[PDB]
Subunit: 317 residues, 4 copies
């Protein structure tokens, strides 16, 4: 039997006997993602070049507007916005959403894969909604996932019931369920990080990468892949296994990726898929944020691979 | 004035006062590329999953390119990554061109939605003999046209001819390649290097030294950033657009490299050269290698000329 | 604020505090309509003509499979199938659906507008589902409407809250609400029927049509339009006002159009729009069917026009 | 073997050993039609209705105008949308005159009736500076003509010396696929098409002819009637299924209603190349010598037996 994202989400919502607010949220997000996909694939660019005589801004506007008009949210955090957006009282629902509307867009000029990252929290207090409502550990996530605009467009959705992958069929504008209850390989064969920063590496990262190229147990050296677009690199890690690292460097003593709308959602996707996500010192999802745009280092992926990194990290204390 | 691929090729062809065969070939290829793009983006996948109650993407791509080229009446010999022997076009449909292509490069990892691409190189049949596989045994220096389609965040066709390199964005709303970047040139020196560093234990000593110099610059310059998608079209395009260097060099386990000369290396070398870049095997220009086997491999280092020259300096230093 | 079909239906469902089965039904139906639209616009026809070296059956299969897989239906009546389709027990829900999956398809060779017509009933008895659960008068309809595959694709959805029109944006595959709570003109200026068969007209039809062409007073004659596709002619009647006739005659004393999946859905839409729909002797929606494929005469459209027709009809009765 | 619009046209041009200007014009027209189809099907309408927080006939006109100018193949353009002939700037002048209706039937698009684009292509005949007069040629002089129908699917119908060919737009890939080669219309059909709402104004010849279709004097089967009210849709059905299409003069339109330059002549040319007929009653449409770019004509067109039958009645009434 075929299944779509909205039908899948409605069935789960009707099972849980919820109010329907989360379903409305996820449906609105789905609409926004289809619109972002259409723009990313350059539908209508001929009009820009004069047939009849931006992108990260448009993406942000699409997610902002669809989430506001969902009547399901009260606080919105975007990579694109300096302060938290507070929804007007008339359109408020109970959820907080942190999102990166077009991750990797800085390199979109070379048509690299790009993506949308989102994480959903329930507002916990009876206080007036404020920026601090988004300062929750990733453990509190109700849902998270990403849309990858790669060779094809796919939405990966993680909830308590696990991780599910939906392929956007552009012929009919429907997300089709193609991978149910996804789990990541226990051990991979690919490591993913920017080795251009080798001079700035923590000794623990240096040692670990050396182990990937020169295995101590006579196994084959790992392959290296680094797209430089987080959603693309993390998705490949989910599908084929292995390990993704964005550790600290000289420019980024707290890492470079953003905790709320980059690290936490992927960490949630990884953990719900049987993977792991760590800063080195603790689980990503256990970090308690104090600033909506704060950075965190992240090592994530297949559990054996992450544990091997953490084994190395602890050796260097 | 807006400009499209087919219109651009027609005007350049009318300038050259050619017979129109090359225009017909390229327009047929453009149709195949649009069809490959549609299938790659998974149009119609709902039917595969039972919405109404099947070929692999690289087989479909090959069939699409094969059929459109045969029916263009502009070709006589077709070399595909997918086929052991060159395909000889039927006599009724023969034209004067030989085309070597990789119909869907990078498809082995397509399960993770990595960018993939189509690569092509176009030669004129040089001999008066009846067409045969030997007609594809030409150095890249003989290319008439070459280029690639990148199926990335958007679909783009990069086309190289004597007049230079031009980039066309596929507008999927209307099925037209729109000219968006004219007479494209690569940066003289870049800041990114691209190769699979996981196989470092097998590196040639010159490759080890150069990569070390990019990470630990001896002259107090900034270290280069690293990017490696692992799909040749994606890495080559990023190299073209942002500058830098792409390497799949020879090593101890692979003394001739891994990438294929006819339908991977030569077209990408041709594009680099028309854009002011460089492409070498280490020993010589990729376009100067004289192939002896249509599926032979060649090592390739390509990209910004300053970066490639710096690599050859290290390579010659280690003899 | 933008509004889509599934979001519209969800909010209406949350107001009614239903179980969500109807919402799942309508979302499933919407998915089928987008797929029918894509096929009707001939997406992928290049493959049929050899680029790499029926339509009403596909449409029927699309609606059938989406409705079965919704877990919302138990009996399905289709123009394409001799007998009622009984949903297997594991997939049974509470609704009965009557539909014409591709109406007007007999003339699709000329690319004439085509459409999908549907009517949704609540199963009334606890008996085992059977053909008899579809023998309900149109008065019992829960929802009805049609999809028009014309210059653009539009879904017209009629419920208790009135008639609403949704335009398919094929760039993103979303039905966008473009006309809310539509009402038909009290009186129109267009009559619609096949005048080529005038020799067999009932004398009342002959008189009424003559009055449209040769008005007894100083008014303008009505214009004539007859697409020959019921969905197209009925939609124009809804949009511009006027009257559409497929009446009974001596050779066809029960009309030609089918009650369950042509007349009743359109009659329901007309009545929710402030229009009228009659067989000549009674309202279409009051006919109690005895056969899932039974025919009915139908005259529908603007109320002043349908009443004027009934004046003439009663004169010859 | 598969064939596309551009490939078909190129092959015909290489056979004719022409300069390539007509191929370029037709390729430019094909692009504009695909863009018109996309807008007609409402791609991107969600943005108009606020998803992120031109009228179609104006847009259609801009698409055709801009694509034709930039083709470098035209010198004078007549559009239903423009009061005067548009003269191409000298740098972009080519040898062809094009008369077109960029979105015919758009007045009823609110009900999603099929709409279409109609075009007729002439070679500029005089050596004078390009002017509005270059479009005042009889349809007999047409080099190419046709239409795109935005119906259930989008189809481009193209008539040239080699006959009539029909290309279906595949929206998945944006390619017109040749699906019906060298099309001919049925010698006699079973459908007549006209707005009988003007029955009180009909000349006796039309009234009599229509009576014969409904009540045939030989007691054969009566014709069925179809009238979409969008000319491209009605003429296309007439081409595909045979029969007869009529728009005669009436009191509101004593010179007929349809436009000679960019409605009657192109359809007349397609009909004639398909083995059909197209008449004003008095003469062949293609023989009318126009004096005004927006002038109207009565038109009766379709299957040859059916139009000849109309003309017998017409002559009977003098
Ligand atoms: O959507 C609903 N309920 C619902 C939906 C329909 Br249709 C009809 C009746 N009820 N509840 S929810 O809280 O939004 C939720 C969504 C997803 C998940 Cl996994 C859990 C909870
Ligand atoms: O197509 C033509 N000529 C041509 C085309 C038309 Br339409 C009308 C008249 N002439 N010549 S060609 O040899 O194919 C060629 C194409 C591109 C380039 Cl860059 C060079 C050569
Ligand atoms: O969907 C629901 N309820 C619902 C939905 C959510 Br979300 C959360 C809670 N309840 N009810 S329904 O029976 O499907 C229905 C649909 C449309 C209409 Cl007009 C009436 C009834
Ligand atoms: O296009 C050409 N020639 C042409 C085309 C290519 Br490709 C390569 C070389 N020459 N000539 S044309 O005048 O445009 C024409 C088009 C269609 C028809 Cl039926 C007749 C005449």
């Amino acid at each position: 039997d075929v299944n779509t994202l909205t039908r899948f989400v409605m069935e789960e919502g009707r099972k849980a006997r919820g109010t329907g607010e989360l379903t409305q949220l996820l449906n609105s997000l789905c609409t926004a993602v289809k619109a972002i996909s259409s723009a990313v694939r350059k539908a209508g660019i001929a009009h820009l070049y004069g047939i009849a005589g931006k992108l990260d801004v448009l993406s942000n506007d699409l997610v902002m507007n669809m989430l506001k008009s969902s009547f399901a949210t009260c606080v919105l955090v975007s990579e694109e916005d300096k302060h938290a957006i507070i929804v007007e009282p008339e359109k408020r629902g109970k959820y907080v959403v942190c999102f990166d509307p077009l991750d990797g867009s800085s390199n979109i000029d070379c048509l690299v894969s790009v993506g949308t990252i989102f994480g959903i929290y329930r507002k916990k207090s009876t206080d007036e909604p404020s920026e601090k409502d988004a300062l929750q550990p990733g453990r509190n996530l109700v849902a998270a996932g990403y849309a990858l605009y790669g060779s094809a467009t796919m939405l990966v959705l993680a909830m308590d019931c696990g991780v599910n992958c939906f392929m956007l069929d552009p012929a009919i504008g429907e997300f089709i369920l193609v991978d149910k209850d996804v789990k990541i390989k226990k051990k991979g064969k690919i490591y993913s990080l920017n080795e251009g920063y080798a001079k700035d590496f923590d000794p623990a990262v240096t040692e670990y990468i050396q182990r990937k190229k020169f295995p101590p147990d006579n196994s084959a050296p790992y392959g290296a892949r680094y797209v430089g677009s987080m959603v693309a690199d993390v998705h490949r890690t989910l599908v084929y296994g292995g390990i993704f690292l964005y550790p600290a460097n000289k420019k980024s003593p707290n890492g470079k990726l953003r905790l709320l709308y980059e690290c936490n959602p992927m960490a949630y996707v990884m953990e719900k898929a049987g993977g792991m996500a760590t800063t080195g010192k603790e689980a990503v999802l256990d970090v308690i944020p104090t600033d909506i745009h704060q950075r965190a280092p992240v090592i994530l992926g297949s559990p054996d691979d992450v544990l091997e990194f953490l084994k190395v990290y602890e050796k260097h204390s």
